[PDB]
Structure formats: structure tokens, C-alpha cells
Ligand binder design. Sequence first.
Ligand SMILES: Cc1cc2nc3c(=O)[nH]c(=O)nc-3n(C[C@H](O)[C@H](O)[C@H](O)COP(=O)(O)O)c2cc1C
Ligand SMILES: CC(C)=CCC/C(C)=C/CC/C(C)=C/Cc1c(O)c(Cl)c(C)c(C=O)c1O
Ligand SMILES: O=C(O)c1cc(=O)[nH]c(=O)[nH]1
Length: 366
Amino acid sequence: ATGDERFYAEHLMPTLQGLLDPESAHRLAVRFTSLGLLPRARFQDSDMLEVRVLGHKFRNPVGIAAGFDKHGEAVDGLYKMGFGFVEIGSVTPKPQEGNPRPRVFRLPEDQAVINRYGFNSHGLSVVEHRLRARQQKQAKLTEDGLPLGVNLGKNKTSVDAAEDYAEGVRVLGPLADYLVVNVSSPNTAGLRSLQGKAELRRLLTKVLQERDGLRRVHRPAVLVKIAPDLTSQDKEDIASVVKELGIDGLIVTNTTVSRPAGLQGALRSETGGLSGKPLRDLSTQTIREMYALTQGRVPIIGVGGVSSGQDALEKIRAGASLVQLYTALTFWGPPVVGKVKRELEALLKEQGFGGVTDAIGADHRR
Ligand SMILES: Cc1cc2nc3c(=O)[nH]c(=O)nc-3n(C[C@H](O)[C@H](O)[C@H](O)COP(=O)(O)O)c2cc1C
Ligand SMILES: CC(C)=CCC/C(C)=C/CC/C(C)=C/Cc1c(O)c(Cl)c(C)c(C=O)c1O
Ligand SMILES: O=C(O)c1cc(=O)[nH]c(=O)[nH]1
């Protein structure tokens, strides 16, 4: 509706993408966000958008997904952009470079991205100090309805995956409102095998024990982030383990290793995870499945191809309590956040929902 949305989407972003390679663009976006060089978002969040979940108030249900701010450099700039919550990461225990460049690719004709970053990470110690420098500022933000998530990965050469995640819980758990056990990156060999029943149960038991050993004020919720490429068996098993262990929530979904028929981008056959519009409905359907398998009792953060209020509401009605976006930001720029929120509010009113909370899982009750 606004002129700024139009200017960014039709002119500024496509022009700048024509000038800058994907990883240079990503780095500049992080820099510009971190320095607060963006104008403050003018959208005032209505009470209809507030969600209480995971032991926290969320001023609005639209978050920035993991992978944008991998190293916790731009958290305050992201809240300024109008995100209701920020997830940083993935962070690995030791610093690591990730894959050789180029490792990110735009598919403009599909409104999609393919990436194979491979968990490039400053490491736990660097991120720990970065978050400690603003820990009390974050405590106030959280109290004000603006929570922080930290997404944990594992190093390429580690000989004990569970210990990598445990180290992440110990080091960054005390600084996070929620932690994410990311077992769904398509870009680390053997990682997605940790989604299997026996491996997942053993990994999450260890993670939860570590979390429970933190002091009360420093004890985060623990969520598991899952792939969009799971078999029905895999999903049944994850739901079973989640309920057996009392895992606090799920993030649904990561990027897809599938390549849906109809992709037009020249770079469609690059190796990596596919994000954006072609992922959207695969993610929505995964949310729908996981909500049903967990009887609506396990909070879900829905992610994959959200670019509009309709996209957000579809995931909410399928069972998401909160949503995230990333790829839409890369195409449309900062005004997409306000756009999604304004559209979501309008649609909630049009469909007779009192607020976001009333719409969570609504399709299952039709
Ligand atoms: C360039 C890029 C880097 C990403 N890095 C991470 C990561 O480090 N950890 C993670 O859990 N997900 C990562 N993701 C996945 C996103 O968090 C999200 O699950 C996925 O992109 C679907 O959302 P979208 O379609 O709105 O981008 C990344 C995605 C992209 C496009
Ligand atoms: C996305 C954002 C906060 C933009 C602010 C305006 C700026 C500084 C734009 C210039 C850089 C640019 C064209 C970024 C778009 C872009 C990209 O084109 C791609 Cl490919 C990626 C992977 C990312 C990751 O964040 C990305 O942001
Ligand atoms: O670092 C990456 O390559 C990465 C991690 C992840 O979880 N998802 C993704 O698409 N890329």
C-alpha cells in the first residue's frame, strides 16, 4: 500500500541486486542494519498482533529467521525494522569458515534463493561476548515483548554432535529466550540424520539436561528446527520424541533440498537449500502435519516463503503460533516487515479473529 514498499520492491532492491553479488549484498544488509542506518519502522503494533507463547510475550508474531544475522551483529537494528522477535545463528562451537565462495545464489524468476553457506560462524565465544555487551538491554527488550532466539549448529569436523549442541546450550543458553537445535541444515554432511528417532532422543535428552542445569533466570525454551523434506515416518518419530521429552516447540521448516517442478532461475540446479516462494506451501503443509501430530499442544514457529499477510495467516491457521521470514526481506527490503504485519492485521479482522491467538490452528477446527 505504501510508497516506500513500492520503491524498495520495484526499484531499489532489484537495482542493487543487479549491482552486488549475493554474499556481498548479504554482508552489506547486515552492516546497514547493525549501524541503524535504516529509518525506524513507522508501523505501530496493535494489540491484535500480541502472542503469549514459550514463556514470553511477543509484541507481534513476525520474526527474522536464522541465517540473516548468523553472528549476532544486527539484533537491535532488526527490532528497529519491526520484527517481533529476532533469531540469530546458526552458531557453531568453534569458529569456522563454511563453504568456498560463491555459496549463495538468487533465483529472481522464482522469488527464491539457494544457499550452501555450510555454517560459517564466528563461534560461541565471539557471539557470547557480543550478546553479553547488550545483555541487560536485551532483558528490557524481552520484558517489552521483543524476545531473542539463538540457533545452535555443530562444527564440520566435530566427532560428537551432541557435545557440540550441549556446549551451545551452556555458552549461549543463558543469553537466549529460546534456543534452537538445528538438525536440519542441508549443508553439513550427516546433520539431517540427527532427525532420526534414536539419534534425536539421545541428542535432545542431553540438550534438555544441560538446559535444565542453568539458573532459572537464564533457562531458555528449547525448540527443534526441522527439514521440509522428511518422510511421514520421520515426522511421526519427531512428534513422538517431542512429546516424550517435553521439548518446548518446533521451528518448521528449514530450506528444502527438493527442486519443485517449475523453477525458472538459471541457478536452480546449484547444490544447497532452496528458500522463498517455492518452499512456501511445502512448509505450510509440514506445519499442518506437525500441529496435528502434537495435538496442538506444542508451539510451532512457521517459516518458509512468507512474504505477505496471507502467507503469514496461512501458516498461523495451519498451526503456527509465530512466523519468521528471511528470503522475502532479501527481495523486497525492510518495508516487507510492515507490509506483512499490516496485511495480517487486516486479514484477521476480515476473517473474524479477535487476534493472532484466536487464529492459531483454526484450519484444524473447521
Ligand atoms: C542465505 C540463508 C542462510 C541461512 N542460514 C541458516 C542458519 O544458519 N540456520 C538455520 O537454522 N537456518 C538458516 N536458513 C534458513 C532460514 O532460517 C529459513 O528456515 C528458510 O530460509 C525458509 O524461510 P524463507 O523462505 O523466509 O527464507 C538460511 C536461509 C538462507 C536463505
Ligand atoms: C535486506 C536489507 C535489510 C536491505 C537494506 C538495503 C540495502 C543495504 C541493500 C543492499 C544489499 C542488498 C541488495 C541486499 C539484498 C540481499 C540479497 O540480494 C541476497 Cl542474495 C541475500 C542472501 C541477502 C541476505 O540478507 C540480502 O540481504
Ligand atoms: O549455513 C548454512 O548453509 C545453512 C544452515 C541452515 O540451517 N539452513 C540453510 O539453508 N543453510
